């Protein structure tokens, strides 16, 4: 895994799968205490943002993905 | 305010300040308790949450701490 995602994994998040997200972000689906989490890697491969991505229509894309799984 | 940020705003987040974030993201500091929102370079997507660096430091916490 990319460094920030690997570092997050070492802090108790299990990484489940990767996905391509919009805005040039690479997505990682993980779990923290049996709850789904989405982590987004910046283009440089060096930073990652754990949280919820919203689009131009106000859709919470992360919820969509986590709920689907 | 970008469209995706307006949509987080609707959930009871007030936007206070912008900042330059690593990884080429545009940062927005808001309040609910401090929150950080990161806009993608295309300006059409935004992520409410916490940014971590290469060694797993939570960068958002530090920023929110300083306000």
For B51, the closest of A47, A54, A57 (CB atoms) is A47
CA B34 to chain centre: 10
- In chain A, what residues touch B25 (CB-CB under 8 Å)? 42, 47, 49
Chain A touched by B20 (CB under 8 Å): no
Q: How far is B64 from chain A (nearest CA, A)?
A: 15
Cβ atoms A57, A68 nearer than 8 A = no
Torsion from C-alpha of B38, A49, B41, A26, nearest 10 degrees: -150
Q: Are A24 and B40 in contact (CB under 8 A)?
A: yes
Write b or e for each residue in B8-29: b if 16 or more Cβ atoms lie within 10 A of its Cβ, otherwise e. bbeeebebeeeeebebebbbbb
- Report yes or no: B19 at the A interface, CB cutoff 8 Å: no
Any chain A CB within 8 A of the CB of B53?
Answer: yes
Asked whether A40 and A49 are in contact (CB, 8 A), the reply is yes
Resolution to one decimal, Å: 1.9
> Is the CB of A7 less than 8 angstroms away from the CB of B44?
no
Asked if residue B63 lies in contact with residue B19, where contact means CB atoms within 8 angstroms, the answer is yes
Using a CB cutoff of 8 Å and minimum separation of 24, what contacts does A31-40 make? Answer: A36/A65, A36/A66, A36/A67, A36/A69, A37/A13, A37/A66, A38/A62, A38/A65, A38/A66, A39/A5, A39/A8, A39/A13, A39/A15, A40/B47
The DSSP string of A16-36 is EEEEE-STTPEEEEEEETTEE
**Which domains does chain A carry?**
1-69 (3.10.450.70)
Asked if A49 lies within 8 A of B10 by C-beta distance, the reply is no
The answer to whether B24 and A44 have CB atoms below 8 angstroms apart is yes
Mapped onto helix, strand or coil, the DSSP state of residue B24 is helix
């Amino acid at each position: 895994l990319p460094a920030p995602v690997k570092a997050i994994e070492k802090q108790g998040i299990t990484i489940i799968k990767t996905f391509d997200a919009p805005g040039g972000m690479k997505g990682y689906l993980g779990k923290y205490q049996d709850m789904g989490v989405t982590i987004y890697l910046t283009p440089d491969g060096k930073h990652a943002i754990s949280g919820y991505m919203y689009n131009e229509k106000g859709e919470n894309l992360s919820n969509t993905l986590i709920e689907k799984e």
